């Protein structure tokens, strides 16, 4: 067999410090967090609010911080892609916890259906970016494939805002075809 997959993920980033309240509950667990945003100009920052789930954040001794931080955007998109190729759904169905370990469990669940990695390609979409072969060797050792089967690249977009996104496609092939 041959199978193809697609994944998508996006994270606002990037390791900010949140000043969260108990949110607003009016019906007939969510928080409301304020932080110093980052604009494309380094020495300039901006106040901004946002709702986050107490699970997506981690406190410190209110005062919280995003859980993902940091990259780990491509691992998620690539994960979904590898799962989708094998018809196994979304990341949330995995259970175990590190962004890199989620991918490793995804590939373990893919060779459990009889597929090795044929070819993987990832597209990173950013605003103002380098160390790509580094990220490319980590995907290769996690997928038990050669570095020449993994490709990563970044395209850019040069008033002010932030955000980082990624798409990934994966091709799977049935393993054990050395007959």
């Amino acid at each position, epitope marked *: 067999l041959i199978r193809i997959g697609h994944g998508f993920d996006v994270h606002a980033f990037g390791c900010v410090t949140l*000043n969260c309240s108990d949110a607003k509950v009016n019906i007939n667990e969510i928080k409301n967090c304020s932080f*110093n945003a980052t604009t494309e100009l380094r*020495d*300039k*920052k*901006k*106040k*901004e609010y946002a709702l986050f789930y107490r699970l997506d954040i981690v406190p410190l001794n209110s005062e919280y911080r995003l859980i993902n931080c940091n990259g780990d955007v491509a691992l998620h998109a690539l994960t979904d892609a590898i799962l989708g190729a094998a018809a196994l759904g979304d990341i949330g169905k995995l259970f175990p916890a590190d962004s890199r370990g989620l991918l490793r469990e995804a590939f373990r669940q893919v060779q459990e259906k009889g597929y090795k990695i044929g070819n993987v390609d990832i597209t990173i979409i950013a605003q103002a970016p380098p160390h790509i072969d580094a990220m490319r060797a980590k995907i290769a050792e996690d997928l038990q494939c050669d570095i020449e089967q993994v490709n990563v690249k970044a395209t850019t977009t040069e008033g002010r805002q932030e955000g980082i996104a990624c798409e990934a496609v994966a091709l799977l092939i049935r393993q054990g075809l050395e007959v």
Partner: antibody
Amino acid sequence: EVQLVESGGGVVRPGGSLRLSCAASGFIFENYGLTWVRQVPGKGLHWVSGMNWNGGDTRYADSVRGRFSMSRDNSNNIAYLQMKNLRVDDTALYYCARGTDYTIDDQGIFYKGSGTFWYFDLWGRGTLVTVSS
Amino acid sequence: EIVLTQSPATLSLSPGERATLSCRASQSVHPKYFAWYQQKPGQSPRLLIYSGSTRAAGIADRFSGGGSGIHFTLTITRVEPEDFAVYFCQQYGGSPYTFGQGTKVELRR
């Protein structure tokens, strides 16, 4: 037309207590700092206190520290001034003035929406406080 | 902790001519952490200068601020009738922030 309005001023006897209130309108209250200023009619201005957008940087004058206390409730656009142990000297007119909508640290970086209490552009009417037995 | 003393106490001038006010500081103040105000009888102050020399909204270019360290001056070039008031200086480079005692620019006759 942005506006600030003080209220609650009146009479109080030495060693008494009194609480002033400043009510804002026409602008994003949560972005700006705040300050209080006292002034005797005919004589000059004197800084009382000042705070930043959330209240985490509150300071007072040498004559007022540990005696007055200043806070704010951003939810309803209002700030207060808690006064205790009133000497007769504290008799004056108490203004409420608005700070900035930005702030800078010792590295030179600019934080918009994180106002402070440096210079003041919007001044209130002024409420009178008389401390006399 | 930082006290500001401005001179003269009163500066009697006739419309048209120059007015130079001085504000001396006890210790050094950053040249861009200074401010000035104007106040007429029975009104609240209005901001003229902040960040040492940048004018406020509605303030024409006859008002001109500046200085550094211990010497700060405000100068009006062509005094006009609407300009006769009392002028306070304020430093905010070190807590507690503080005002001056006030220079009165009156009309000479």
